[PDB]
Design a binder for this molecule. Structure first.
Ligand code: SF4
Ligand code: SF4
Ligand code: SF4
Lengths: 176, 70, 299, 74, 156, 97, 171
């Protein structure tokens, strides 16, 4: 099963050789190339006007690294360190202490947005879907200090929108 | 579409239109309305010099038509 | 009024080249699927103006006299080379102007070599030496083809040329000669497919694109156009301007499409394809008026 | 043959050979010679009358001398 | 007061002319170069903003470091960085560039690009989306809007 | 002298453009830090064809004279000699790469 | 800006010749000779001059200095002044100023000649009916009259081509 190419000889019939000679000395297929480029000139461009028209995306985009909390309740996090156990860049840093109430919680929960390669393993490895990849794309921060998110940064980040993340999860809790 | 490339074409064509219009109006404006006498040959320059001489205005384009017959 | 004529020539060269840059960028954009540029202001005019400004405020660094003397020659050619171009009434009625075109193209070759010497002993200057060699390999072709297309016009005066173009265009008695000459205009403008190749970059860039507009205006005058009706020259000005604009868009449009040559393929192609064909078409144009009994009125 | 090898060379030698040979066939080279000889530049001089010539017409209106009439008749 | 008015309007004019176009040079080692080429795409034009890809270093306005810097690359990186005009700004694109990223705990990898050049914009992502990089370039333009250069020269 | 005035105005305005390119920024901020043979053949080749162009090019001014046969003869002889020089370097494999 | 505009352009012409015959570096010499060729073209076009001066300007400036600077740049270096060069320029400038002194402040200047240094509108024609040029039918000879001369000229140039390729490794 094969199809090898460049099987034509230059035909020594006078018609084909004078057509190639007129092609050479009349500049024909160069004008054919100009015709193809004009055919793409008079089309309509596929340029979205970016700061107004934002581009299309997916329901499963991987953005913000936000956290979540229970409906009328506290943090969905447990600090069982599975996300630091699976984080391939080892960007997750967890130090955990329980409060006086008895339930297990944290102290420190750090994401190196520098080191973060944005897999989705921490989304697809947390047993309660505590840390969730956000929908957005805008981090764009001027100082290298400020791309090191702390736990309270993530809480004020995930509490900046719930219904977005919950809408995506309700759309996407069956394929995964 | 290319409706928007047409203002750039039009403005740059205005920029191409202006120097010829300015030149032609200055020739028709600073030579008494007569076209500037193009001259390449010594015959025509001698003719132009005697023309500007016989006018008395020291301008060759005044052209002093048909009055010194008497 | 004569300095006013000079100012009305060389003040629209800045606007002409800048709006040429926006026109070619927009045209390449619509050749592709791009609206570039339209966001920055109304249809992208302040973007080339303010971008030229930003290019003037770049603050660069550094032989110094040579580095002075090269772009000053380039831009004074770009200024002083629209003099006899007969938009109906030319600036100076030169008895011969086409040979002045050839001489100042050679002065542009001077400019490129002086920049290459000022580039201070670099593999870039070896490449610029090769660019000087390819640019100098073209004024043979341009002068000989220009000689033949004026041979059907008698005199060098170019007003005789605007007389000759009244009945039919001169594109019909010499179309393949015109084709080779237009490829030589692509060649002299040192742009695609004929490439490659510090500051002041605005002045050097200005010199190249004013050279482009000169070659397109001279192309439009040499081969086609309209009739010089006196006491309304603006009609000829408008029709000439429209045809020159369409030719310059076609010129950038042919630049928008093909990969650039190999240097040795460029030399090989130039000599072994244009140069015997130039000589053969030119000897046929010599023997043509004696076999049609139509030698032009050399006054 | 060589028509595929270097075709621009073949067309060049063809138009060159016709440009060389082709002036041998013309009804127009005599017209070229008459045009390019009978165009006056300098002044047509006068001369003394008493050579008693049955030529050299004394009046420019007078057609007794050799002139042109095929010009206006193309 | 009126001199302050003149300096303010002139400074705003020249900062506007700087933030007008800003053509960079595409440095681009790894797959973030492919995403730079994909923000040169028809669906996301650099050329709508005056942004032009141009590898001429001597007319580079800003510089986009994108890819994975190595020890063998870094001296040539700063040697390219210094042959640049004096108003210069750096966009670090990519998780590798803005802090080492996935190859962080490794030899032959410079930990980010803070260790070579000053950095102005950090746009993260692996790769950062062309969407996100273009948001970063707009935020760069607004950083250029807030600069008060000639006002500081006037009250100097 | 009109064209001398044009040359003077263009030269002076272009020098003012160069000095605007150089001595404009008042913000003095921080001052910081083998050849080949086949290159030479092309130039002399151009040179000799340019010389024969100089021989050819006063042709159309000459087109109004009586000795048409000698004109056409020596004109064809000049273009033929030019093409013979080209064909000589073409067949003696000179300008090749 | 006076009567002696041909004389002033002649003075700048002599200045350029002294500028490269003061023996500079050869690319500076090529610069000065470009200056000299431009102002000599100015002198001949002042005599009018319409055809031949701007004609061979193409061959001289348009064909020679480019090849000279080409070979000068590619062959040797002189890559980064001396008192002998500037001293030759001093002596040339002093002899030029001495000629200006003896022309303008005296009647005549005689080295071994008789130069009447005054307004050189003389000699000139009294505006005859030329109606073409002198140069027009002048160089529009060589074809109805020039049988032998252009034949041996083109023959010499063809021999020049074969000489050049032989020296630069014929075949
Ligand atoms: S975010 Fe999830 S996986 Fe990570 S420590 Fe908390 S509960 Fe465990
Ligand atoms: S996406 Fe990957 S690198 Fe980023 S925090 Fe989650 S597991 Fe770690
Ligand atoms: S950040 Fe990701 S996409 Fe960019 S260079 Fe590194 S591995 Fe490639």
């Amino acid at each position: 099963t094969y199809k090898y190419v460049n099987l034509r000889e230059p035909s020594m019939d006078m018609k084909s050789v004078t057509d190639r000679a007129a092609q050479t000395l009349l500049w024909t297929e160069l004008i054919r190339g100009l015709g193809m480029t004009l055919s793409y000139l008079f089309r309509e461009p596929a340029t979205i006007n970016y700061p107004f028209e934002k581009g299309p995306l997916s329901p499963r985009f991987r953005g913000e690294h936000a956290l979540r909390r229970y409906p009328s309740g506290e943090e969905r996090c447990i600090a069982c360190k599975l996300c630091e156990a699976v984080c391939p860049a080892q960007a997750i840093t967890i130090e955990a202490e329980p409060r006086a109430d008895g339930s297990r919680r944290t102290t420190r929960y750090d994401i190196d947005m520098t080191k973060c390669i944005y897999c989705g393993f921490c989304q697809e490895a947390c047993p309660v879907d505590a840390i969730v990849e956000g929908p957005n794309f805008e981090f764009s921060t001027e100082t290298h200090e400020e791309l090191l998110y702390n736990k309270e940064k993530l809480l004020n980040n995930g509490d900046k929108w719930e219904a977005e993340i919950a809408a995506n999860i309700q759309a996407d809790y069956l394929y995964r | 579409m290319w409706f928007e490339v047409l203002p750039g074409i039009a403005v740059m064509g205005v920029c191409l239109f202006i120097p010829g219009m300015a030149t032609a109006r200055i020739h028709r404006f600073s030579n008494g309305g007569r076209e500037k006498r193009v001259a390449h040959y010594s015959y025509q320059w001698y003719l132009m010099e005697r023309d500007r001489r016989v006018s008395g205005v020291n301008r060759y384009y005044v052209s002093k038509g048909l009055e010194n017959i008497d | 009024m004569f300095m006013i004529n000079v100012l009305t020539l060389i003040i629209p060269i800045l606007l002409a080249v800048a709006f040429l840059t926006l026109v070619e960028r927009k045209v390449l954009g619509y050749m592709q699927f791009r609206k570039g540029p339209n966001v920055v202001g109304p249809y992208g005019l302040l973007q080339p103006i303010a971008d030229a400004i930003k290019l003037f405020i770049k603050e660069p660094l550094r032989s110094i006299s040579m580095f002075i003397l090269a772009p000053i020659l380039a831009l004074t050619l770009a200024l002083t080379m629209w003099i006899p171009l007969p938009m109906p009434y030319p600036l100076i009625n030169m008895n011969l102007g086409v040979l002045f075109m050839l001489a100042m193209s050679s002065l542009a070759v001077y400019s490129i070599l002086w920049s290459g010497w000022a580039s201070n002993s670099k593999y870039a200057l070896i490449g610029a030496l090769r660019a000087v060699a390819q640019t100098i390999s073209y004024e043979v072709t341009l002068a000989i083809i220009l000689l033949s297309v004026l041979l059907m016009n008698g005199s060098f005066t170019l007003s005789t040329l605007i007389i000759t173009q009244e009945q039919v265009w001169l594109i019909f008695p010499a179309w393949p000669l015109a084709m080779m000459w237009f490829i030589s205009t692509l060649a002299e403008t040192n742009r695609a497919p004929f490439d490659l190749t510090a500051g002041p970059f605005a002045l050097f860039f200005m010199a190249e694109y004013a050279n482009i507009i000169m070659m397109n205006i001279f192309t439009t005058t040499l081969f086609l156009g309209a009739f010089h009706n006196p006491y309304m020259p603006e009609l000829y000005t408008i029709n000439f301007t429209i045809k020159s604009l369409l030719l310059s868009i076609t010129f950038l449009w042919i630049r928008a499409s093909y990969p650039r040559f190999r240097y040795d393929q460029l030399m090989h192609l130039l000599w072994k394809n244009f140069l015997p064909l130039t000589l053969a078409l030119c000897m046929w144009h010599v023997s043509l008026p004696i076999l049609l009994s139509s030698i032009p009125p050399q006054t | 043959n060589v028509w595929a090898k270097e075709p621009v060379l073949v067309a060049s030698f063809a138009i060159a050979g016709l440009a060389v040979i082709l002036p041998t066939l013309s009804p127009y080279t005599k017209y070229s010679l008459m045009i390019n000889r009978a165009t006056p530049y300098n002044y047509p001089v006068p001369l003394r009358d008493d050579g008693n010539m049955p030529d050299v017409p004394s009046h420019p209106q007078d057609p007794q001398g050799p002139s042109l009439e095929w010009l206006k008749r193309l | 007061s009126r001199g302050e008015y003149v300096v303010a309007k002139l400074d705003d004019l020249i900062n506007w002319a700087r933030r007008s176009s800003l053509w960079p040079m595409t440095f681009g080692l790894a797959c973030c170069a492919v995403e730079m080429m994909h923000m040169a795409a028809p669906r996301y034009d650099m050329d709508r903003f005056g942004v032009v890809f141009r590898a001429s270093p001597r007319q580079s306005d800003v510089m986009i470091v994108a890819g994975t810097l190595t020890n063998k690359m870094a001296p040539a990186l700063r040697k390219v960085y210094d042959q640049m005009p004096e108003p210069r700004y750096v966009v670090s694109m990519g998780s590798c560039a803005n802090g080492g990223g996935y190859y962080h705990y490794s030899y032959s990898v410079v930990r980010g690009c803070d260790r070579i050049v000053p950095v102005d914009i950090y746009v993260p992502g692996c790769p950062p989306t062309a969407e996100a990089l273009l948001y970063g370039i707009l935020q760069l333009q607004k950083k250029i809007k807030r600069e008060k250069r000639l006002r500081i020269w006037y009250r100097r | 002298m009109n064209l001398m005035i044009t040359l003077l105005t263009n030269f002076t305005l272009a020098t003012l453009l160069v000095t605007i390119a150089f001595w404009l920024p008042q913000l003095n901020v921080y001052s910081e830090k083998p050849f080949s043979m086949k290159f030479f053949l092309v130039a002399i080749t151009f040179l000799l064809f340019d010389l024969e162009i100089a021989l050819l090019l006063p042709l159309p001014w000459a087109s109004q004279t009586t000795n048409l046969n000698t004109m056409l003869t020596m004109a064809l002889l000049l273009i033929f000699l030019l093409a013979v020089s080209l064909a000589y370097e073409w067949t003696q494999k000179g300008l090749e790469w | 800006m006076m009567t002696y505009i041909v004389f002033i352009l002649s003075i700048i012409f002599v200045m350029g010749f002294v500028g490269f015959s003061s023996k500079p570096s050869p690319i500076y010499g090529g610069l000065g000779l470009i200056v000299s060729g431009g102002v000599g073209c100015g002198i001949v076009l002042n005599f009018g001059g319409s055809f031949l001066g701007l004609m061979v300007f193409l061959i001289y400036l348009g064909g020679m200095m480019v090849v000279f600077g080409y070979t000068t740049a590619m062959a040797t270096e002189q890559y980064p002044s001396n008192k002998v060069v500037l001293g030759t320029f001093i002596t040339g400038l002093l002899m030029e100023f001495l000629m200006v002194y003896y022309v303008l402040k005296d009647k005549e200047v005689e080295i071994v000649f008789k130069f009447n240094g005054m307004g050189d509108w003389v000699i000139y024609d009294t505006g005859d009916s030329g109606f073409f040029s002198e140069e027009a039918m002048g160089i529009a000879a060589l074809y109805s009259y020039g049988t032998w001369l252009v034949i041996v000229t083109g023959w010499s140039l063809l021999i020049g081509v074969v000489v050049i390729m032989e020296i630069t490794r014929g075949n």
